[PDB]
Amino acid sequence: EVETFAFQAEIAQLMSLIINTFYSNKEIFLRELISNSSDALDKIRYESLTDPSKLDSGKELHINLIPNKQDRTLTIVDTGIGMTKADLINNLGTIAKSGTKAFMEALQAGADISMIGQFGVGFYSAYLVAEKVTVITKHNDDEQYAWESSAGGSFTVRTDTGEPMGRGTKVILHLKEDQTEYLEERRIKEIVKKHSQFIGYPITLFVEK
Numbered sequence: 001e002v003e004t005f006a007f008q009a010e011i012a013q014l015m016s017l018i019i020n021t022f023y024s025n026k027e028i029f030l031r032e033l034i035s036n037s038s039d040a041l042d043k044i045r046y047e048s049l050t051d052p053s054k055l056d057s058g059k060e061l062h063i064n065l066i067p068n069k070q071d072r073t074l075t076i077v078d079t080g081i082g083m084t085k086a087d088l089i090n091n092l093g094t095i096a097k098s099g100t101k102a103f104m105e106a107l108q109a110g111a112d113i114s115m116i117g118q119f120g121v122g123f124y125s126a127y128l129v130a131e132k133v134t135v136i137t138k139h140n141d142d143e144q145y146a147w148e149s150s151a152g153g154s155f156t157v158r159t160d161t162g163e164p165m166g167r168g169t170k171v172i173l174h175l176k177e178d179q180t181e182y183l184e185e186r187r188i189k190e191i192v193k194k195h196s197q198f199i200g201y202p203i204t205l206f207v208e209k
């Protein structure tokens with residue numbers, strides 16, 4: 001059972017701007033997704049200090065980066081707090097509306113797309129490099145879900161029957177044909193070192209087989 005939803009108009013407008021604007025410094029998408037994973041890990045770590053059973057779904061707090069050239073995907077996995085169905089359908093977009101308005105105003109005043117994370121909407125930078133984004137996520141208080149969007153105004157949400165993940169989020173970036181440099185080990189290593197060198201969780205870059 002797949003449910004289809006319309007983005008709010010303002011979020012659709014943000015996604016079109018990210019897809020259509022000429023902007024060569026695309027590599028910042030990875031910093032933004034790693035930052036979001038770090039924030040999700042911070043959140044489960046803090047909650048676990050008052051309820052240690054919140055880690056019954058997995059004690060390890062980490063970020064994995066997994067390129068797959070055969071599927072042309074780059075997957076960012078974290079064992080953070082995860083997202084509920086309400087987060088995926090309503091809550092994240094509600095918060096993103098105000099950050100989007102502020103980001104758009106900043107761009108008109110001279111900011112550039114690399115500053116997107118200062119407005120809280122860095123997730124959508126994934127569309128600098130991905131034609132489709134699939135998010136598999138599991139929060140302790142809800143079931144495992146898959147969110148997916150190729151932009152164009154709509155997204156889907158379904159219960160996920162694939163390999164259970166325990167807790168956290170996997171962001172699967174289906175890369176555009178001209179963005180396969182982000183599958184190369186040396187390129188991902190360069191980007192992590194430049195923009196994510198002080199993240200407080202282990203980041204493992206998997207190697208392709």
Ligand SMILES: CCc1nnc2cccc(Cl)n12
Pocket residue numbers: 088092093096123135147169171
């Ligand atoms: C990683 C998933 C995610 N993070 N931020 C947002 C905003 C809207 C929709 C989704 Cl799936 N998001």
